[PDB]
Design a protein around this ligand. Structure first.
Ligand SMILES: CCCCOc1cc(C(=O)O)c(O)c(I)c1-n1cccc1
Ligand SMILES: [Zn+2]
Length: 196
């Protein structure tokens, strides 16, 4: 099977937001609205904003999962490559096979789905800090898009789902991800290709 990627704001008006980081050579994470694509360095902080129009109930959670973007690869589980799964870079909570980690949240839970074998990471919803209008989750991607025996140059999507306490769908959004050494240059190149 394949997880749905259909954008769905749902009853709470759920959607993502991204910072405006630019495309300088030194940038470690940058989002392209024209491509709906995040470009980031390996294991660096990727701030993703969560926005709602109304407050979801206590017990609502936010889950992240990666799938391959190309249809001919969509049924294959996205996982870390044979090198990175063995490099003992554990944070003490994320299984070493998981591509996506949540940084700085001791309530993050990592799931290996017993039926689909897909990986995901889920956190409880928390209200914005006083003075803020949205909540941010900090993600890390733990392999390069190019890693041999893993993503192997195949593009991926991240699907972010807002879920109730039982895991039922409340909202969904998604974005493509490229994990690469020079996200600013790659964003500029791909946006130029799109303009041409
Ligand atoms: C108590 C559990 C539910 C609390 O979740 C939110 C509340 C508000 C609010 O304004 O009360 C909000 O703005 C956001 I963004 C979230 N939220 C959504 C996903 C992650 C956090
Ligand atoms: Zn790797």
């Amino acid at each position: 099977s394949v997880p749905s990627q259909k954008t769905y704001q749902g009853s709470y008006g759920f959607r993502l937001g991204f910072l405006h980081s630019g495309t300088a050579k030194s940038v470690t994470c940058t989002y392209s609205p024209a491509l709906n694509k995040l470009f980031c360095q390996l294991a660096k902080t990727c701030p993703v904003q969560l926005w709602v129009d109304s407050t979801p109930p206590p017990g609502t959670r936010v889950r992240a999962m990666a799938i391959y973007k190309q249809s001919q690869h969509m049924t294959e589980v996205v996982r870390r490559c044979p090198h990175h799964e063995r490099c003992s870079d554990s944070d003490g909570l994320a299984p070493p096979q998981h591509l996506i980690r949540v940084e700085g949240n001791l309530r993050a839970e990592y799931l290996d789905d017993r039926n689909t074998f897909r990986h995901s990471v889920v956190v409880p919803c928390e209200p914005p800090e006083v003075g803020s209008d949205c909540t941010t989750i900090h993600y890390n991607y733990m392999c390069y898009s190019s890693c041999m025996g893993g993503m192997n140059r195949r593009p991926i999507l991240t699907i972010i789902t807002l879920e109730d306490s039982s895991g039922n769908l409340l909202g969904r959004d998604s974005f493509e991800v490229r994990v690469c050494a020079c996200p600013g240059r790659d964003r500029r190149t791909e946006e130029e290709n799109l303009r041409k």
